[PDB]
Write a protein that binds this ligand. Structure first.
Ligand SMILES: Cc1c(F)c(F)c(S(N)(=O)=O)c(F)c1F
Ligand SMILES: Cc1c(F)c(F)c(S(N)(=O)=O)c(F)c1F
Ligand SMILES: OC[C@H]1O[C@@H](O)[C@H](O)[C@@H](O)[C@@H]1O
Ligand SMILES: OC[C@H]1O[C@H](O)[C@H](O)[C@@H](O)[C@@H]1O
Ligand SMILES: [Zn+2]
Length: 257
């Protein structure tokens, strides 16, 4: 199966997922000087007050915190979005060292990690139908830099020892994803894709400008996870990021003047 190593990583994915070389791939470098303020963007609304987290899963690529998306409990609206997008899961991408790990870059600068809150457009009824649509998904991306600890991340950090290997899961109820946001909702937006196989071109990306700060100890615990299953030789789960892809016929728009 696909992964992030030399023999199954991003440079190999196109052989089984030809859209990897498509017209709308993610991530991209965000050139902050070329990005243009867009007055047509509406105010962004992140409404997570009623979110219901359920479970945390090591899927052999990253870990996903899953939400009850059987109703509009936690939604993203506004900004570039037409309609309501329901939160289904979040996960991260991170590096083996603090100088890399993010998928998007900002004027080519790589952050230590990147958080993705994944939402699907409710007009399509289920995530599976949504990923057959050009506007099926919205991913809210948040950069992580290493500095002071992020208190709202610590519950995630502390459960990782129980999901060390691929296929392990644990209860993860009553987690509030609002604690993972920065203060400002200033953002850049562009049309793109999943950054993992199957690389489907369904995503409106909304990437926040303000990083969150996490401590070195927090990110070091991400790096103790394993790509491998239980019993198998240890392969540390690090560098699970795809590099920036060609911008092609796209423009990045900014929410801020
Ligand atoms: C043995 C092997 C590969 F060489 C490979 F390139 C990929 S791919 N294109 O998905 O990255 C695989 F899934 C795989 F199992
Ligand atoms: C199922 C799934 C992923 F595994 C994933 F990694 C992403 S990503 N990195 O583009 O945020 C998604 F949007 C997504 F829907
Ligand atoms: O033709 C002018 C238009 O060009 C487009 O590429 C830009 O996105 C618009 O902001 C601009 O008004
Ligand atoms: O909120 C996520 C999780 O945080 C801590 O692990 C709590 O002990 C647990 O009860 C909860 O599910
Ligand atoms: Zn992701």
């Amino acid at each position: 199966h696909w992964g992030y190593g030399k023999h199954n990583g991003p440079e190999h994915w196109h052989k089984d997922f030809p859209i990897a070389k498509g017209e709308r791939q993610s991530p991209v470098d965000i050139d902050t000087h070329t990005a243009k303020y867009d007055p047509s963007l509406k105010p962004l609304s992140v409404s997570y007050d009623q979110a219901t987290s359920l479970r945390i899963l090591n899927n052999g690529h990253a870990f996903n915190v899953e939400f009850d998306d059987s109703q509009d409990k936690a939604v993203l609206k506004g900004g570039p979005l037409d309609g309501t997008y329901r939160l289904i899961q979040f996960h991260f991408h991170w590096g083996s060292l603090d100088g890399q790990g993010s998928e998007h870059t900002v004027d080519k600068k790589k952050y230590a990690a990147e958080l993705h809150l994944v939402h699907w457009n409710t007009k399509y009824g289920d995530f599976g139908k949504a990923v057959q649509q050009p506007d099926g998904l919205a991913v809210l991306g948040i950069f992580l830099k290493v500095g002071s600890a992020k208190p709202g991340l610590q519950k995630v950090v502390d459960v990782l020892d129980s999901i060390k290997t691929k296929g392990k899961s644990a209860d993860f109820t009553n987690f509030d994803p609002r604690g993972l946001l920065p203060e400002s909702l200033d953002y850049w937006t562009y049309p793109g894709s999943l950054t993992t196989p199957p690389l489907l071109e369904c995503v409106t990306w909304i990437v926040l400008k303000e990083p969150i700060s996490v401590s070195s100890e927090q990110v070091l615990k991400f790096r103790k996870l394993n790509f491998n299953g239980e019993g198998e030789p240890e392969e540390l789960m690090v560098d699970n990021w795809r590099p920036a892809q060609p911008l092609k016929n796209r423009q990045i728009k900014a929410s801020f003047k």
